[PDB]
Amino acid sequence: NTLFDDIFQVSEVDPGRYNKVCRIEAASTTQDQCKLTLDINVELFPVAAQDSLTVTIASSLNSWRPPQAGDRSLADDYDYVMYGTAYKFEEVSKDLIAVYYSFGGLLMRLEGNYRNLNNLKQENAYLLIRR
Amino acid sequence: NKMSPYELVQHKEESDEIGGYFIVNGIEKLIRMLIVQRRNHPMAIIRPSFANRGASYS
């Protein structure tokens, strides 16, 4: 089931001496407190500055196995799906929680109000990107 | 000594055989050049071992 949903405006895309991955800084359009930095390989899911991305963190998609015909998942509604682990939590200040996810080495930092991010635990999670 | 390269080849030696070495018991030897003091020039020497040549020795 879903743990987090939002829409982010991408401000910058810095390649950082990588030919496939990029670091994306994005600010939420609904809550001013929600910001997100995320490493994504732009070889598969290319992005640009001033791009609106629908970002969803989920607990599952309802071991691993390559998909067969007629496989139902929550990944169908999104374009770019990564799988990762949360490893760090911090408090920027009162009423501000920053959670750190690692998707096989690709880092994501998600900062937002603790009530919006209360569904996030220290567990495996799927990050889904649309548009 | 003054054999041409053709004559050197005719006498089994080499096309461009060079000398400078003796043959002793079938083994080729040479006498290495040494470095020695320059001849006929008095050079000032400050050597501690001179003091070891005896007492009252600078």
């Binding site: - | 080849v9 005719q10 089994k12 096309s15």
Partner: protein, 69 residues
């Protein structure tokens, strides 16, 4: 000593192209590159086979124990 039968790197037979190479350099006033190209040696692995051969065997052959001089 004598020209190799084959190029080391790839294995192309180049032992049949030494007298031809010398004749191409000798009669026709050619440079080494054009003469090698005319012989069909494209890759530099084959080109340095005939370009850099020294052909020392001739110098060996003048010392003949089996014939008087």
């Amino acid at each position: 000593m004598i020209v190799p039968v084959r190029c080391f790197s790839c294995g192309k037979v180049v032992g049949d192209k030494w007298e031809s190479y010398l004749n191409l350099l000798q009669e026709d006033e050619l440079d080494e590159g054009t003469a090698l190209s005319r012989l069909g040696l494209k890759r530099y692995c084959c080109r340095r086979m005939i370009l850099t051969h020294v052909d020392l065997i001739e110098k060996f052959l003048r010392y003949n124990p089996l014939e008087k001089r």
